[PDB]
Amino acid sequence: TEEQIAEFKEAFSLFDKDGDGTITTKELGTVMRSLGQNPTEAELQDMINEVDADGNGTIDFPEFLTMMARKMKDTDSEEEIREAFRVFDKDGNGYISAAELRHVMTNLKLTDEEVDEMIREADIDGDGQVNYEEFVQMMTAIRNKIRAIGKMARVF
Amino acid sequence: LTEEQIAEFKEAFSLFDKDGDGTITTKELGTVMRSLGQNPTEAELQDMINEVDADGNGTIDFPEFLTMMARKMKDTDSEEEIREAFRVFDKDGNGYISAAELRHVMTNLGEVDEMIREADIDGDGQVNYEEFVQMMTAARKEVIRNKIRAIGKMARVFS
Ligand SMILES: [Ca+2]
Ligand SMILES: [Ca+2]
Ligand SMILES: [Ca+2]
Ligand SMILES: [Ca+2]
Ligand SMILES: [Ca+2]
Ligand SMILES: [Ca+2]
Ligand SMILES: [Ca+2]
Ligand SMILES: [Ca+2]
Question: How many angstroms does the Cα of residue B132 sit away from the middle of ligand 3?
Answer without folding.
Answer: 36
